[PDB]
Amino acid sequence: TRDQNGTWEMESNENFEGYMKALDIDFCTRKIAVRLTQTKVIDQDGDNFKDKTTSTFRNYDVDFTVGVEFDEYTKSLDNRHVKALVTWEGDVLVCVQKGEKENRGWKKWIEGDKLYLELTCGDQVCRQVFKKK
Amino acid sequence: TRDQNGTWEMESNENFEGYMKALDIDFCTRKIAVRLTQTKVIDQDGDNFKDKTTSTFRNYDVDFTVGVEFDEYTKSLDNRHVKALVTWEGDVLVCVQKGEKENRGWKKWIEGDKLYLELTCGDQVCRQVFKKK
Secondary structure, three states: OOOOOEEEEEEEEEOHHHHHHHOOOOHHHHHHHOOOOEEEEEOOEOOEEEEEEEEEEEEEEEEEEOOOOEEEEOOOOOOOEEEEEEEEEOOEEEEEEEOOOOOEEEEEEEOOOEEEEEEEEOOEEEEEEEEEO | OOOOOEEEEEEEEEOHHHHHHHOOOOHHHHHHHOOOOEEEEEEEEOOEEEEEEEEEEEEEEEEEEOOOOEEEEOOOOOOOEEEEEEEEEOOEEEEEEEOOOOOOEEEEEEEOOEEEEEEEEOOEEEEEEEEEO
8 A cells, every 4th residue: 555654663674784784884883773673653645755764772761669679670771680779868869779780770869950860880880961851 | 859850861971881881781882872862751759750761873854755856865874965766666665866876775665554665775685574553
């Protein structure tokens, strides 16, 4: 049929690497585009089309209750099982990710309208700040 | 303030490489995760949090009309300038991308509730199958 209207999600992708190498796309760029899923939104009205293709790199989503230990699987990070626990220390949201890697956790808090994130794992600390959209 | 509600977009991302290396994340993944802006959406009800963090790898919007040639700049993938002509072949949307690469183009058609996309460049053929939602 010619009616290509609707939102479509990639379920298979054959020889995406060979086609990208034929376009002289860089090495690390190809090895990830093969792994990622793609969503295609098409608005077709008559002879005019509008194709919006989006490939999401990371789509993490976790729920929790402060003070209640829960099982966390970092699917889109390292894909490991950690028993996370989120507690309050002042107004800072502190978390401990009990698992194989030692000193793993994060701290989250706002001051003004900036979300601060302190991702820690072993000897490394990652600092990220966010603006309100 | 403990209220972390809202949609937050990444401002800075310091030492994401070191934090990802501490989690044994591969090199190519680190080289791309470092260069992407993240968006955090927190739905908070007291101590019940809903944290969803997403990052977009590729996004591409194209507007074209069947039978009218248009200048296409492949924002994703290739970043080359091609003159694309999209035409109907029965129920198959056939497009030719006249440019640097020989035999560059794609074919798109619907069968049932699935979108089939065949990308062609040189002697390489990439076949992508989508599913209507």
